Symmetry: C3
Subunit: 225 residues, 3 copies
Amino acid sequence: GRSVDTMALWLGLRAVLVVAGLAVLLQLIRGWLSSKSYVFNREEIARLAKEHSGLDYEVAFSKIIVELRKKHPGHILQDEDLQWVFVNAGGWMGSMCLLHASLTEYVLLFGTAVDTGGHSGRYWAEISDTILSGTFRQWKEGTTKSEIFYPGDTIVHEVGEATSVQWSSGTWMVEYGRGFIPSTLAFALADTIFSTQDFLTLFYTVKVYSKALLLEASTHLSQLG
Amino acid sequence: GRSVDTMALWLGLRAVLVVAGLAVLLQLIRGWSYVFNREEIARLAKEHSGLDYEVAFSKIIVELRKKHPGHILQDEDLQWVFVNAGGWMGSMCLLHASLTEYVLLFGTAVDTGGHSGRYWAEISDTILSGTFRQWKEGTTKSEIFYPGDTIVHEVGEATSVQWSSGTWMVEYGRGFIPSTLAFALADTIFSTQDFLTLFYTVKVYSKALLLEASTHLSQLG
Amino acid sequence: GRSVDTMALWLGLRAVLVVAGLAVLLQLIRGWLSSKSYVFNREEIARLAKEHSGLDYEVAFSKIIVELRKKHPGHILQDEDLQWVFVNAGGWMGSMCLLHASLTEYVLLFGTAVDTGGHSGRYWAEISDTILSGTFRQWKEGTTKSEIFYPGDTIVHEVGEATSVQWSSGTWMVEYGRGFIPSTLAFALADTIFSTQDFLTLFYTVKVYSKALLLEASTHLSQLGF
Ligand SMILES: C[C@]12CC[C@H](OS(=O)(=O)O)CC1=CC[C@@H]1[C@@H]2CC[C@]2(C)C(=O)CC[C@@H]12
Ligand SMILES: C[C@]12CC[C@H](OS(=O)(=O)O)CC1=CC[C@@H]1[C@@H]2CC[C@]2(C)C(=O)CC[C@@H]12
Ligand SMILES: C[C@]12CC[C@H](OS(=O)(=O)O)CC1=CC[C@@H]1[C@@H]2CC[C@]2(C)C(=O)CC[C@@H]12
């Protein structure tokens, strides 16, 4: 009959249900009970980006990098280490220039030159994007309506929150993420693995992340030494 | 590399396809009751398509609970769950789901689009608000559909779908529903990594199955 | 503490770094050391497509196919083997009609009837797209600005270059690719494997590829004694 298939389907769905729920619980436990020392704060970066949001996004990029190096020496990558690397994730495609990255924090310049959009990702990390140019449409979970954000505004992707993001052509922003940063890595690379097959972009991403970790360790050792 | 592996892949898949095709034809003959029908849901959604999509959602849910008691989820079980599939991202609120049928409210608040999916199920979407661009397979031109229209995604058919921001519709599917699950979750597995959304999806599906089983037992018992 | 986790994360990142570098190096080695026999040249297809770029894209398709069969008989698929096959790749969705395909070259008609865009793919193959209708937005790697291309233009995706592509509704073009063609197959099918699950489209893709390869082998063997 069909009630047998219904029972079997419900049991298989229960298996998937428990597996996914325990994976979510493991994510919550690893994030929640993780290390929490912070070099930056979201409003510092927010004000720094909003202050320069009236300029051309490239002049703003340069001045923001200079100010970050001035106020946090030893935590921002050198000019020789700055690079624009494509980022394909959740169905959207942008590009990044990473300035700081540790085990618990990261700072970068993000944006796209094409109309793009997709899933924001869900992870134990609070993300904040202060727009320098363009538009940022955010569609929160559980609602049927979205909101537009413009230069000067700061969108906060909360911990455990999932949204839909959409960016118009030429949208550029300064992004600061705080939490358990490695848990985001998966989401950052899935489309690179199962969609673009761009192993050179994966190479660039892991290389800049390892360089940022090396810089953080070097600064820590020089300050204890 | 060698083309031989491609030849084996193409020749091997043709054999599996031919066997699967013969199995499908035997099932079509094997075929010869449904709670809904695509024309009922289509007319019900087209009737309320002139109102605001939220009022339309509410009135359609009320009418479905009135005309089909025991087959629609309670208000406590209704939930908007994201749906990432075929490269597009929308959201759903499931009202009914069994082994052979499902009813839901679908739509997106952002401009999105991608692959429609291919599965053994006849899908019908009656638009309440927005626009729906459909690009059928094998053709070089697409068509736009507006509120009141009803797009029928035929069994085994694959199209390209595109929805503008704020597009909302009522959807009814009939066939072998589990065969769609794969397409429903692929982007959740290999793209978004949103395991909480996967949890919500399988949870509402299991709740709908449990409600259907409870109604069946109460009607036999 | 946290320095242990930082060290473990850095070691894993270095592992991914060397593995990805070895994958890129294998791709470069398979590309550089491959066949050089070419039936066409990108400038031939580019001029042939630009000449017909003022007509309707369907009439342009027909006339370009006729001219390709005229100037290279036995290397273009028959009308019975022509078919529009969906292409989901890098996050975008279009459709193709393959006319010629070997280990080192391929020719097809590509385009989309919906607004789409995504990753162009990275592989050892030089691609050229001459636009018949629509618009083609290209965003190169390392830059923060994109460029629009219109009918008559020819975008050249160089070897090892990665871009972002975007096509407006009704965009159609003639495409010629030269290099290590199999390395693109992965990129061509990834979204079909890990997103759409459309195995019938996978069948159509491998079918048209195998038929083009069989046509090439049959022409070479029949032109020889066998
Ligand atoms: C993947 C993610 C997280 C959130 C952003 O999504 S967004 O919608 O909130 O803007 C995209 C984004 C951009 C770059 C990604 C970042 C997560 C952390 C990553 C992997 C590093 O350490 C190096 C590069 C970083
Ligand atoms: C698999 C399918 C089919 C309808 C949608 O197809 S679509 O073309 O309108 O996007 C996508 C989709 C999303 C979620 C799926 C639904 C089918 C019925 C499902 C499995 C339940 O009972 C719980 C969640 C439901
Ligand atoms: C994967 C790619 C390469 C790039 C094309 O256009 S592009 O703008 O993305 O560069 C799209 C595309 C479509 C079909 C693909 C083609 C590459 C060569 C392929 C794999 C064959 O031998 C048979 C089908 C062909």
